[PDB]
Write an enzyme that holds these catalytic residues in place. Structure first.
Site: not given
Ligand code: HEM
Ligand SMILES: Clc1cc(Cl)cc(Cl)c1
Ligand SMILES: [K+]
Length: 405
Positions: A177, A242-243, A348-350
């Protein structure tokens, strides 16, 4: 403002949506994006904003595009184009087949097995953080929880000192952003500048942190370069700061405004996980994209080699053609359908790390602070971009209603 309409783009398919400052923002980012799904908006539109690009508005198309990596390459995945071109993180900026060898190595550092071990530590910090806030009867959720809970855990996995968080998060946010103080190109350089000395250092005295593990790793058998490792660590960093930070804020804001939901999870704790998926659908927040490898006709539309197309992972689950009454949070929704963690070869690996963090948050907060509301009169503002987020969330509660553990 508006880029002149490319000759090949149909005038009737223009819908000038601005992904960094959407029209309906004050109604909420998700409601702002959902405007693309209104009654007379096409499956595929062209926005002249941010230099001009396609936008797929429905899950069915969003899904096919992500699955079709031959036509829709991840090589220039960011909007505007200049950001997309400098975006060289690994493995995100790569397509199979080359992507895979690096995706595996990244998977080893943030995957479920790593998550399992991080388990007790995550819970401790959620508790340490919640109990410490409990008796105050107020907090500004984004800085008192959303940010330190996720980021700290990540800074630990990465084995980085917490003193660096303000700098890294500033750089990460300029990527998702941008506020104008810096370009994607400048943000990445500074992030690449930060990592270099660390990667060379952990390459000589190999620790057990994620950075060391990527720095001394191998891709399908051969040694990873210092540069390869940097491009990979830089992305992990972006994925770590930032997730979840932002998603927690969206969920807790909704919970502060809906006692009924809070009560459901209080009286029926076993529903927390399902509620977590439903919240991920409802409060989805990522939107990145792809670039056309060649000219290609997609769902009756002529895409030209080089055109960028934004495929809002956020939109799939908000699509009424995927979930009835999409804007409605239903913790019992029988088929929660979404692409919040992506779709295709870049899933997404996370997500396992994100799910745990989310589920421990819900469990531990409701346990100590079952009743809370948004500060009186507070006007919540969202912010849109590659990752949408919340500006601030002031929360208030009566200490008397709380329970220490
Ligand atoms: C609510 C939390 C999260 C959401 C919604 C989310 C969403 C996504 C999405 C949509 C993508 C696909 C991008 C594409 O296809 O271009 C992605 C990729 C990725 N994410 Fe997550 N993410 C979250 C948390 C995390 C966390 C905590 C990490 C670990 C630091 C992480 C690491 C990654 C990595 C390494 C990739 C790249 C996979 C590849 O490119 O093969 N994410 N994420
Ligand atoms: Cl482009 C991108 C990359 C990562 Cl690592 C996470 C998210 Cl949410 C988006
Ligand atoms: K690129």
């Amino acid at each position: 403002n508006l880029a002149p309409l490319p000759p090949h783009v149909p005038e009737h398919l223009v819908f000038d949506f601005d992904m960094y400052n959407p029209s309906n923002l004050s109604a909420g980012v998700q409601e702002a994006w959902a405007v693309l799904q209104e009654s007379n908006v096409p499956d595929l539109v062209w926005t002249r904003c941010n230099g001009g690009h396609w936008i797929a508005t429905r899950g069915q198309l969003i899904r096919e595009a992500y699955e079709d990596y031959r036509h829709f390459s991840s090589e220039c995945p960011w909007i505007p184009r200049e950001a997309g071109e400098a975006f060289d993180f690994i493995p995100t900026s790569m397509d199979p087949p080359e992507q895979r060898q690096f995706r595996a190595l990244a998977n080893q550092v943030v995957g479920m097995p790593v998550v399992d071990k991080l388990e007790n530590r995550i819970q401790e910090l959620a508790c340490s953080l919640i109990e410490s806030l409990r008796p105050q009867g107020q907090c500004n959720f984004t800085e008192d929880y959303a940010e330190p809970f996720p980021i700290r855990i990540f800074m630990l996995l990465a084995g980085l000192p917490e003193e660096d968080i303000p700098h890294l998060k500033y750089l990460t946010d300029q990527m998702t952003r941008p506020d104008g103080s810096m370009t994607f190109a400048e943000a990445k350089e500074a992030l690449y500048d930060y990592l270099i000395p660390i990667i060379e250092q952990r390459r000589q005295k190999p620790g057990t942190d994620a950075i060391s593990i990527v720095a001394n790793g191998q891709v399908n058998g051969r040694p990873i370069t210092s540069d390869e490792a940097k491009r990979m660590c830089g992305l992990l960093l972006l994925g770590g700061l930032d997730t979840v930070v932002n998603f927690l804020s969206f969920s807790m804001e909704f919970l502060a405004k809906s006692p009924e939901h809070r009560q459901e999870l209080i009286e029926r704790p076993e529903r927390i996980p399902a509620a977590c998926e439903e919240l991920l659908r409802r409060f989805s927040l990522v939107a990145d994209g792809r670039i056309l490898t060649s000219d290609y006709e997609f769902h009756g539309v002529q895409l030209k080699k080089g055109d960028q197309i934004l495929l809002p992972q956020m939109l799939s689950g908000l699509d009424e053609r995927e979930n009835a009454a999409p804007m409605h949070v239903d913790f019992s929704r029988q088929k929660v359908s979404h692409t919040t963690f992506g779709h295709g070869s870049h899933l997404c690996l996370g997500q396992h790390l994100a799910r745990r963090e989310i589920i421990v948050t819900l469990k531990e907060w409701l346990t100590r602070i079952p009743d809370f509301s948004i500060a009186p009169g507070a006007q919540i503002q969202h912010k849109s971009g590659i990752v949408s987020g919340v500006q601030a969330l002031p929360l208030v509660w009566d200490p008397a209603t709380t329970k220490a553990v």
